[PDB]
Design a protein around this nucleic acid. Structure first.
Ligand code: SAM
Length: 93
RNA sequence: GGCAUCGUGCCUCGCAUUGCACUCCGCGGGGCGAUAAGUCCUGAAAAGGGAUGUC
């Protein structure tokens, strides 16, 4: 869909603890660019999914194209662009 | 430290969940101030932290 600073990742293994997931996502995705923040909740609506906020869209695009489907804690990651700017990014625009 | 109450969030099990958030709580059982986390609180920010009542 329309390119965004923030990639939306779901199909994540819901048994990973909040901290380990967040840092794993940071460790993996920081090759593709500078990460402003990563947002992870284990709530019913928000489990199995994460927002990764890149500083540059080029990183997000390259991240999404390159990591798509990657086996991650025994599930393949599904990556889409976020439907919407993260507050941290829009608060700048 | 103990009682009792409330804010905040974390871990864990069963069942359920593929879910687009930053305005944030699946139901049920268990364990929690703890250099964790926090959406709550202090502070102008860096940062720091449960609070109230009670013996
Ligand atoms: C009434 S319970 C809170 C339950 C929670 N508010 C809920 O919706 O299920 C109070 C107890 O939870 C524990 N607790 C709540 N917040 C905590 C925190 N941030 N850190 C450590 N323990 C906490 C404490 O052990 C306290 O004795």
């Amino acid at each position: 869909t329309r390119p965004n600073h923030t990639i939306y990742i779901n199909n994540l293994n819901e048994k990973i603890k909040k901290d380990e997931l967040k840092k794993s996502l940071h460790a993996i995705f920081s090759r593709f660019g500078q990460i402003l923040d990563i947002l992870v909740k284990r709530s019913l609506k928000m489990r199995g999914q994460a927002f990764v906020i890149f500083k540059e869209v080029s990183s997000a695009t390259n991240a999404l194209r390159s990591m798509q489907g990657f086996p991650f804690y025994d599930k393949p990651m599904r990556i889409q662009y976020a439907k919407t700017d993260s507050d941290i990014i829009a608060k700048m625009a």
